Design a protein around this ligand. Structure first.
Ligand SMILES: [Zn+2]
Ligand SMILES: [Zn+2]
Lengths: 362, 362
């Protein structure tokens, strides 16, 4: 019935835009075929729609954002229920729309999203690799379009007047390349040199101009914080990671998010995390910083406001460094090698942070 | 001094043949740049050579085989020592030369081989994916050529009259695609449907026209068989897997190879395994078969000769099926689901096999 719900796309346009040659510079355009269904998979689609946009900036107008706005205005016209949405999209999301869609999914317990992509946009770029990881951690099921998905998108969204889908040569080969790329980037862990150069707690003198943050989530069960090995992650920033964790899909109760950040939060980040833990009493926040970041501004007030709003803030010591090496680093069986003076630098930084957070004088 | 030992290749030829676009149908030819060094990495190369061939059949004349023959006659002209060999090869090995090189490496403790490949040949084909796995398990270090390796092969094997290497557009993007593909196929495990459709022990009535074999290796340490989790594997057939395990790389002394095969060995395979365990007293062989394969010929004599030569032969029961599901299958956390009548079919097959192996009558 999708054929009657949408204005189908020209066959030329489909063959041109959903060709899955990994590298294709010349295709300015993104096409997003979406179908909306109830949670019952047997049921037919309630609605479907084709969105289009350009890949280049003003991502406000990218088909993903158009979908979000349309869907928000669509759900208000039907009774509240649970939805399964499927996308066939010719390019995978940019970084901005990965963040947007991921926060939408993480805050909405009634939506499930499966994204089949024909090609990976900027698959070579660490920012977009991270963006896809963020999408997947928010709960979106990311997949490369295979022959079956191209066939189904032909049958449902393309004006292929009875004519069946005929594949181009190398469709499966492209699928193999792209699916391997997506899998490895989804399972990717931090490079060891990245880790040791960014989490070293000796006084800065080169690099380290970016912030790295690893995080784990635990849930309350029986007066006992029990971990969730499936909801870990690490992010690089050179709006607030708590907005990307789906506190709803997890075992229903209260949670403790433990954070390991190479630099202590900037002012903005501190205020965003404080606002989050204020409006989410079921989430406790623990922050471990490798170094204290002094922005010459209000960073002290930022940390103090974060602390007032319930976050526990400490400096990383050997235990936390070793945990992050063992959990978030592509270590290759090799053990954590502490650098010289780790514990002493950690104790001094702890004293500094103690002075920063202290309210009453003795 | 690799620009004095070899007849360097034309720059045109290098850029044409080492372009790393994954799909390149038109390149008939394989180029293999090899350098031979002592175990000391600081030391300069003792020798170097450029081999060429065609990708298409008569693999006797592929550059890998020409290297093997050249190297065999080269080692006889120098004192016995340990060698580190490096290849820069424009296409990765075919299946036949993967087998040849892998058995050469598995039988020779004094050679180390690193293969950098510009492109993956038939990366989409399960036979070639398995071939690369076989190479890696024999000990070859398989890697995709990156910018640094292209620069090296330019500097060492190409007549680039002082001119430096200048990369083509998309070299890193291609590297990302190819390296992800190589990693995924190197870590690939058996599809769940493949496993249960091929290892089901109820009487044949469809499919199962191929043999699947999973294997683990253990080493003797203080009268206690201790496993080697890094030397497992699984193979599909439509010469003998024992010739591909490097019984020299492992912690020395004696070993026990445990085999789980969907069909019991054909006559040929039984005789090859028997010949192997005869000429390798430090290796014990245990075989577990899911079904008994009756080739209308001498299969009974094959199993009896394998048993006479010291191999332990049994039929798989629940324990072995569950172990293979847990070890060699991409199960995704899902537990082994035994089919109905598994244990009873296993007991009947065990009775049949007992009758086959019985020598003295009671
Ligand atoms: Zn976008
Ligand atoms: Zn070959």
């Amino acid at each position: 019935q999708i054929r009657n719900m949408v204005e189908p796309m020209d066959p030329r346009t489909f063959v041109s835009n959903f060709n899955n040659r990994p590298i294709l510079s010349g295709l300015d355009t993104v096409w997003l075929c979406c179908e909306v269904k109830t949670k019952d998979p047997s049921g037919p689609p309630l609605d479907a729609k084709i969105f289009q946009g350009k890949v280049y900036p003003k991502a406000k107008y990218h088909p993903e954002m158009r979908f979000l706005r349309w869907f928000h205005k669509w759900r208000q016209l039907h009774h509240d229920q649970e939805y399964k949405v499927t996308w066939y999209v010719s390019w995978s999301p940019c970084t901005r729309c990965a963040n947007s869609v991921a926060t939408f999914l993480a805050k909405d317990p009634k939506v499930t999203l499966t994204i089949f992509v024909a090609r990976l946009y900027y698959f070579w770029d660490p920012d977009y690799q991270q963006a896809l990881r963020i999408l997947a951690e928010a709960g979106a099921t990311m997949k490369i379009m295979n022959y079956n998905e191209f066939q189904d998108c032909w049958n449902k969204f393309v004006d292929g007047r009875g004519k069946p889908f005929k594949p181009w040569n190398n469709l499966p080969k492209h699928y193999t390349l792209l699916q391997a790329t997506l899998g490895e980037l989804l399972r990717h862990l931090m490079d060891p040199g990245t880790f040791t150069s960014n989490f070293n707690n000796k006084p800065w003198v080169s690099g380290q101009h970016e912030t790295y943050l690893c995080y784990k989530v635990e849930r309350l069960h029986n007066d006992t914080w029990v971990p969730l090995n499936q909801h870990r992650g690490f992010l690089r920033n050179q709006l607030c990671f708590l907005d990307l964790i789906p506190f709803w899909k997890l075992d229903g109760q209260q949670y403790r998010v433990t954070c390991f950040t190479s630099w202590s939060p900037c002012f903005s980040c501190a205020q965003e995390m404080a606002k989050f833990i204020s409006n989410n009493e079921h989430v406790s926040l623990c922050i471990f910083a490798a170094r204290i970041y002094d922005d010459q501004g209000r960073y002290q007030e930022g940390l103090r406001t974060l602390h007032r709003d319930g976050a526990k803030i400490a400096m990383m010591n050997y235990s936390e460094f070793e945990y992050c090496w063992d959990t978030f680093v592509d270590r290759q069986g090799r053990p954590f090698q502490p650098w010289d003076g780790l514990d002493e630098h950690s104790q001094a930084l702890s004293g500094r942070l103690r002075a920063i957070l202290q309210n009453q004088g003795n």
